[PDB]
Amino acid sequence: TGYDLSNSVFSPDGRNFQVEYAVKAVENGTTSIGIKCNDGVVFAVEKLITSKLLVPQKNVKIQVVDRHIGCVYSGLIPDGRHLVNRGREEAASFKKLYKTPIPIPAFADRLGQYVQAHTLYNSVRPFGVSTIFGGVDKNGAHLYMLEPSGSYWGYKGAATGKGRQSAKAELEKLVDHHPEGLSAREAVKQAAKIIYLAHEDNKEKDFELEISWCSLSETNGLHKFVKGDLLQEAIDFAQKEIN
Amino acid sequence: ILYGAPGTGKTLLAKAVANQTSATFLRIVGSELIQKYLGDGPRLCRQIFKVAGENAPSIVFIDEIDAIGTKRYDSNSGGEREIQRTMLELLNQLDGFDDRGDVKVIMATNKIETLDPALIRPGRIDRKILFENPDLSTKKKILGIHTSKMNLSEDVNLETLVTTKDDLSGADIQAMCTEAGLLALRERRMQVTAEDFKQAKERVMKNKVEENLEGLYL
Amino acid sequence: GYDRHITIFSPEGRLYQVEYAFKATNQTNINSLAVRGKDCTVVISQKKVPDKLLDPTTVSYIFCISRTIGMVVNGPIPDARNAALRAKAEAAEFRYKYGYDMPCDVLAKRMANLSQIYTQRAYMRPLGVILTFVSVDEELGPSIYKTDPAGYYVGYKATATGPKQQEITTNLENHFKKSKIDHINEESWEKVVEFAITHMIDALGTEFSKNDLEVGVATKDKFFTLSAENIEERLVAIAEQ
Amino acid sequence: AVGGARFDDGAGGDNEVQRTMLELITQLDGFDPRGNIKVMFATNRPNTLDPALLRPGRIDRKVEFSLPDLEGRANIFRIHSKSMSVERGIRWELISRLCPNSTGAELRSVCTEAGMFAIRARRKVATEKDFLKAVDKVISGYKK
Amino acid sequence: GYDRALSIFSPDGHIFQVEYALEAVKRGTCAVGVKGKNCVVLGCERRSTLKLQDTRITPSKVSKIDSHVVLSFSGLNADSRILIEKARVEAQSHRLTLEDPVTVEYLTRYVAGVQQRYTQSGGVRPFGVSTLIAGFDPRDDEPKLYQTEPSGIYSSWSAQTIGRNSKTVREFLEKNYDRKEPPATVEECVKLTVRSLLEVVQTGAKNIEITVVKPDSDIVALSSEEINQYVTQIEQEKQE
Amino acid sequence: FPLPSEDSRAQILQIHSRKMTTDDDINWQELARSTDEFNGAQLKAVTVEAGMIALRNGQSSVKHEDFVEGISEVQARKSKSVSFYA
Amino acid sequence: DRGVSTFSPEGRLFQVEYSLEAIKLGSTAIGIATKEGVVLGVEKRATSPLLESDSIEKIVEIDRHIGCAMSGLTADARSMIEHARTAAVTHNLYYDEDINVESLTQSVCDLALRFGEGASGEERLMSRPFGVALLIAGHDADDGYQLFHAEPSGTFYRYNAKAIGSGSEGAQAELLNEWHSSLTLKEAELLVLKILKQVMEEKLDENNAQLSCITKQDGFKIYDNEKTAELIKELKEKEAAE
Amino acid sequence: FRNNYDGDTVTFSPTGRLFQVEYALEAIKQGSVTVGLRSNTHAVLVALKRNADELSSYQKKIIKCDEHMGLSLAGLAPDARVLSNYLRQQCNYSSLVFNRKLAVERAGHLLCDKAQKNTQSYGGRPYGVGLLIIGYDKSGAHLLEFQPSGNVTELYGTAIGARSQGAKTYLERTLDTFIKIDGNPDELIKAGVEAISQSLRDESLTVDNLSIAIVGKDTPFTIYDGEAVAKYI
Amino acid sequence: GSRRYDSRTTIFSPEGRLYQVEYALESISHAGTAIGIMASDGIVLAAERKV
Amino acid sequence: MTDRYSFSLTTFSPSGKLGQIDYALTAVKQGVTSLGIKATNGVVIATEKKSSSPLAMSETLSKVSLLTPDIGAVYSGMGPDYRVLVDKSRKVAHTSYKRIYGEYPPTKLLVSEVAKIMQEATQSGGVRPFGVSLLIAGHDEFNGFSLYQVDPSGSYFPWKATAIGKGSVAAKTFLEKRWNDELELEDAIHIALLTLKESVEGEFNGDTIELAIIGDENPDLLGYTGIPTDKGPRFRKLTSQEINDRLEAL
Secondary structure, eight states: OGGGSSSSOOOTTSSOHHHHHHHHHHTTSOOEEEEEOSSEEEEEEEEEOOSTTBOTTTSOOOEEETTTEEEEEESOHHHHHHHHHHHHHHHHHHHHHHOSOOOHHHHHHHHHHHHHHHHHBSSSOOOOOEEEEEEEOSSOEEEEEEOTTSOOOBOSEEEESTTHHHHHHHHTTHHHHOSSOOOHHHHHHHHHHHHHHHTTTTTTSOEEEEEEEEESSSSSSEEEEOOTHHHHHHHHHHHHHHO | OBOSOTTTTTTHHHHHHHHHTTOEEEEEESGGGOOSSTTHHHHHHHHHHHHSSSSOOEEEEEEOBSSTTOOOSSSSTTOOHHHHHHHHHHHHHHHHOOOSSSSOEEOBBSOSTTSOHHHHOBTTBOOOOOOOOOOHHHHHHHHHHHHHHSOBOTTOOHHHHTSSOOOOOHHHHHHHHHHHHHHHHHTTOSSBOHHHHHHHHHIIIIISSOOOOOOSOO | OTTTTSSSOTTTTOOHHHHHHHHHHTSSOOOEEEEEBSSOEEEEEEOOOOOTTSOTTTOOSEEEEETTEEEEEESOHHHHHHHHHHHHHHHHHHHHHTOSOOOHHHHHHHHHHHHHHHHHOTTBOOOOSEEEEEEEOSSSOEEEEEEOTTSOEEEBSSEEESTTHHHHHHHHHHHHHHHTOSSBSOOSHHHHHHHHHHHHHHHHSOOOOGGGEEEEEEETTEEEEOOHHHHHHHHHHHHOO | OOSSOOTTTTSSSSOSHHHHHHIIIIIIIIISOTTTOOOOOOOSOGGGSOHHHHSTTTOOOOOOOOOOOHHHHHHHHHHHHHHSOBOTTOOHHHHHHHSOSOOHHHHHHHHHHHHHHHHHHTOSSBOHHHHHHHHHHHHHHHOO | OOTTOSSOOOTTSSOHHHHHHHHHHHTSOOEEEEEOSSOEEEEEEOOOOSSSOOSSSSOOSSEESSSSEEEEEESOHHHHHHHHHHHHHHHHHHHHHTOSOOOHHHHHHHHHHHHHHHHHSTTOOOOOOEEEEEEEOTTOOOEEEEEOOTTSOOOBBSEEEESTTHHHHHHHHTTSOOSSSOOOSHHHHHHHHHHHHHHHHOSOSTTEEEEEEETTTEEEEOOHHHHHHHHHHHHHHHHO | OOOOOTTHHHHHHHHHHHHSOOOSOOOHHHHTTSOOSOOHHHHHHHHHHHHTHHHHHTOSSOOHHHHHHHHSOOSSTTTTTSOSOO | OOOTTOOOSSOOOSHHHHHHHHHHTSOOEEEEEOSSOEEEEEEOOOOSTTBOSSSSOSOOBSSSSOBEEEESOSTTHHHHHHHHHHHHHHHHHHSOSOOOHHHHHHHHHHHHTOOOSOOSSSOOOOSSOOOOEEEEEEEOSSSOEEEEEBOSSSOOEEBSEEEEGGGHHHHHHHHTTSOOTTOOHHHHHHHHHHHHHHHOSSOOSTTTEEEEEEOSSSOEEEOOHHHHHHHHHHHHHHHHHO | OOSSSOSSTTSOOTTSSOTHHHHHHHHHHHSOOEEEEEOSSEEEEEEEOBOSSTTBOOBOOEEEOSSSEEEEEESOHHHHHHHHHHHHHHHHHIIIIIOSOOOHHHHHHHHHHHHHHHHHSSSOOOOOOEEEEEEEETTEEEEEEEOTTOOEEEBSEEEESTTTHHHHHHHHHSHHHHTTOOSOHHHHHHHHHHHHHHHSOOSOOSTTTEEEEEEESSSOOEEEOTHHHHTTO | OOOOOOSOTTSOOSSSSOHHHHHHHHHHHHSOOEEEEEOSSOEEEEEOOOO | OOOGGGTOTTSOOTTSSOHHHHHHHHHHHHSOOEEEEEOSSOEEEEEEOOOOSTTBOTTTOOOOOEEETTEEEEEESOHHHHHHHHHHHHHHHIIIIITTTOSOOOHHHHHHHHHHHHHHHTTSTTOOOOSOEEEEEEEOSSSOEEEEEEOTTSOEEEOSEEEESTTHHHHHHHHHHHOOTTSOHHHHHHHHHHHHHTTOOSOOSTTTEEEEEEOSOOGGGSSOOSOSSSOOOSEEEEOHHHHHHHHHTO
């Protein structure tokens, strides 16, 4: 029909076709998952390798809001970086006024009013990226993923991208392992193998494992990158299970 | 190629050239050249040059084309599919026909933009006649023909009738002389006076022809 | 549609943007009920259960603007959160400039006037949700004002949001006709929830558990939303009377 | 006028063009070698033909006819000037320069109309001013 | 297709909207003028065909910009009064800043700049009325005749004919008039100018408005009997 | 049966290279990057236009470098009329 | 369908494609940059003897030692003329020095390469794209005699002999051969008139042809009607001997 | 796909990828081509200058932005000129407030958000020029590849322009060569000349065609021309 | 001709006169007939009304 | 259908009348029926109200608002269109008059300012015209009682009797032939109840019907006592309970 010409159009299906194609654009990107534990959250994202000219630990999309919140998105890279730079200013403006770290459910409202208003505006194009953010605030551990349509809720797990369907079955298995969930280091080892399983669609090329988490146990409320023996153990854990 | 309106530029110009050439006037209807049937299009076109191609006694004339001139894109919306094959094949008959000019082809159409550039083939048709507005000498030559047999009063002269005019064509000026004679029949006389031309010029250019010359840049 | 490209009244005198604005309200297919006791106002919204990747506790169709005041939204989610943050701004600014508690009458009237501004701006989308505001007035008492997507607001004895509103009104019309009052008996606010659950199940024809529903309670100078364990206590309290 | 199908054959009961496509497929493709025997068509629009013939394996090369450039339009006028009496001191390069890109017929019209303007001036040959008026007659009289 | 915007240069290299602006001039009033050695003469045509029209309260086509600089347009009277008003504002602004009188070259660049800025500005309509700016330079008797066109360009002409039948009268100005030796006397330039106007006016008096500009900041307006006096001299050969 | 993908046309062009005589230095995976929206029949016409590049390069056979110049466009389109900065 | 910003999966331009056609319909602007001087010339295009041949000029003087040529639509050109005149006194005001030809050419092209009303990181002047092309010549203390071409589409290029307008494709055919680094000032004046006469339809005289010269000693000097006629007589003498 | 959607850059395509990026990509392919690589201690870019005809001089595609940071211009000219003053203003702003030179990864982000605002805005003129940004900061040498979509990635080196496939293949087999050469800028330039020569059909091999600019720990970013680049050629 | 843009006053019509001015004269004739009279000693105004 | 230029508020209509104006009356015609009757000693107004759900509150809807104590108003159309219009109209009435002349605006000045907002709504692009039609009844010391029919186009005219909505044309012939200018307000109330009853016979009571009149001052509605100079409010809005008392005497 002629309703896809521009934004600010009410379609007969209740949602704009441009928003429908924006959701399909997320499925054309890489796979970014996440796990919400009791003491914190764990982020895992797969970066597609274009060729051997890529340098590791450079293009990593993991961003850190304040010290207690990590940020990762799956979708258009240029459209995603513009939201993180603006999303940091929203969390900074809270500290610039109230003088205290921003809580996660409040950090989602700043991005909510920011993105949802642009979907209502014709001059501003809606965002076609899905941003996954979380951490541990003064209240506790919280995880929220921002959909390209603007709707969001509390998420015990994060699934987006092309392999979100194959990763959804693996995230539901965490209840079968333990009723209370895995540990901090156990969630990193479990989320790593999921990346190798979702690679069957992207297996035409290579990948680099990217995992980050923030909890109150080891880092004591800091968001860092997985390295040392913890990163190498998560890689060999999946090689033995696939074999 | 002819332009203008029938009876003036699309008629008089066609019959005037055939007089001095001492050739028979052969009229072919343009709308009849398309029978909307496969094979009748090129058949009727080749037979035109056949009757005029033996001793070349006459000249081909075609007038009033609203049909074959416009093929559109389709057999509907005023166009026809047989027009595409008729115009394209008629080009071969224009190049194949060769003489010293005893036979000519004169076609009349309103717009040449809908014509096939193939059938046009510039250099085969170098003649384009655009309709021009009649000058002061145009009306004077039309009056002299009718005023010869029509007696004029002492107040009727040549410069009097051409004083106020919209530059009507040679045919419309003839209608003004007929209206002047119609008022003479009301007074029962054979000599049209000057009072009839004053009422005739107002009826012909307004009542008998509706123009009114809409102004304000139009 | 030659005249369909824009938002105007059209040659048929019918707004075609409102045609799809009401259809978006049923996109979520959520049925809610709003009733008013004598001294209290209790609203109940249906909480849909998604898969295990989502938290049902975080999912709420009822937003808290301030104390005693609440908003029930049935329709598109992205238009609900943007209107929730906007409705709270007018509530706080009114308590400053005019220094008075913003009533649900003006709160639904302000959203109605703000809805025309959305239609006045060709680059801005009107609200495609159903704004239902409930509160307890100091004078008028319990009152319900629901703002339609077209900007219409009127008081309701017992309203509803959904395709079943025709069946919900029928059962609640004869209940208020015999007693000749628009308020539920048992002035205690704990017993008002018992009737709000009872009249809703028979109206919708489907009984729901504690995880399929959410129950808000608006009292005088206090407002709260019952958790998953408090809703279970309401079903047990129905059997004890 | 033929193509791969038509109304009286593809949509009709008679077989003329419907059996013509068989000779362009069975004979040319199967039996006839590609080197010695070749086939070339001419059409105003590609869509007027059968989409079955437009598929690869038979009809592949599509040659679009452009219009001559300044150098191409100059070499055409100098050839027509051999059969037409003109002035020995004219220049055919400036004649084709004023005229924009034109078809093969529109270029021959410049030389034929050049003798028409010489009739008004009563001259046996066409001077340079006659070709300049012939180009303006094509530019103004057509405007295509 | 390409006539809906001013920001398109068109495939033909010329905006069709500018060509349509010339059609209003061809159906509008006529403006013809010729400058001599010591003077410039600007004629025009005001249509008296409307009955019950008062010529005294009707402003003349020729408008006064500067003491030594006048202006006469050809086209719609609506868009012309703005071009006259905007020029008069800058005409006074020259003495407010430079203290010198209005320069014909400087005034033309402003009037052409008015149509230039509105053409370049999107969503703003330019002026499709062609104006003729004539006058003398400060402390100079040399006449300067400039024109304005809908294309946003200006050209300098010794004699120019615009309006209805601009080409017919132009042939009269390319033969009897000589730029190498323009008429020295005022009577020779005015009498020949009337003959050029009789083609479009066709034997009329109040339909001709001629304003003769003289040096030392002088403006004279020929009356109805004075304009008709030259008409009799030109038509004397036809009645002789 | 939509238009084949990038890697979907690499196997089709590989079979077309086996039917003809080449240098066998051609990597079918590298030439699939220059193809955009081609079906199984259109790729057969590309191999015909790719062999014509050998005549312009002055080669008796068709090497891998002759395909790279023939698979891009090398037909019609907007050509050289506008290139770089006009 | 065009569509401006919306292209076809081929991707020529639109306003630039229409700009090249508008430039080729303008006046012929021919110039040659040599070691001993830079000579420019234009075709005034006189359609009638009543049209002045000295009041209107397509060659504007930006600086005493720096000239410029204008071929195209004059309406959108005068916006660049006042900008070039402003940029001329700009470098004189701030740095109190004569700006180089390459530095002045880039400063003028800064305005031609941008358009639009909306501003983000730069001020906005042009409300719509302009297609006016200019030929900037002059002499500086570093590169000496230089001749450039101002293109509203891309970056300017350095041309020793450049011809635009309706005489572009015609004049540039002979500029790839007859041009040489040893051409003197007198040889450059006769080389332009020899090419200008072939690319011009009307006869060559002082009325329809006005040239100019740019040197270090005399700066920007315009050939008068008497000096131009003397160079025309010397041109017919050289053509008669060859 | 003719029309039916994509009135401006705001409208998404049915596939979900805006085709305005591919339209601006043709300007990069039809524009100039450049080849460059880097190492731990050095970064180099070899640009191929373009012109019109023999009378037209070759224009340098490398514009100086920062002392330690440089890039090359392949794409539309008016898009790269506005971004040149934007990146240079950020380098001066970083050298004013922070006083440190602008980082490579920070230069690519401000460049990404610059064209992202005009892309999401109604209408506008999105930047279609490709840029390869090299520079040396406290974090070392880095190379970013800019695309008209706004994507920014990190590579040892790449090539954007006409016939860019030849250089990409050469950098894959030589990947382990130039990365192990440190402190010797001569070997990195020799590899760059052989890299661009393989990607080109060899139209004009002369000296004035190639423009080499190298930056490193000791020697800062400097454009070489004339006899400076004639030693390797 | 067939292509007419009446939306903006800035777009010039192929005839040269804006179509909004053409049909504005019709709205004048649709209203009541008003007759002004200018005299030597004053002005007489007589007009009807549309309702 | 024919030309969109009639619908565009920035473009003159090819048909001589803007299509946006004529089709905006259709939206007003689709609404309920509102009328008014102008007499010598007063002006009565009556209208029918939306019932909506059977549980909807009938006391919430008020289609007769208060501008000034000497001027009443009634509307038929969209809900927010009247609210946004009058909320700004009350500010213009106070700013342009009460902040200058320090009184309540008269009938001629107030109604003229109401139509000016509709003029800007039908002029500037992107702003849709109002879908309501206001019938304003007021009394002043100069012109006396006045009844003005305000159309969304922005043109107001005096009317002794008029109707809007679906029953606009139907009740126009009724109110013209039934009512005469020489009658009083008491007979005007009874006629207004009979004509409005013809729209719907389901419920004629004060729940779905609002009734208000204009006239002399009321000392009980003044709010203060002791000042003989200042008269009480001239406008009195009848309570729905008091409307049933008038219906029993009908």
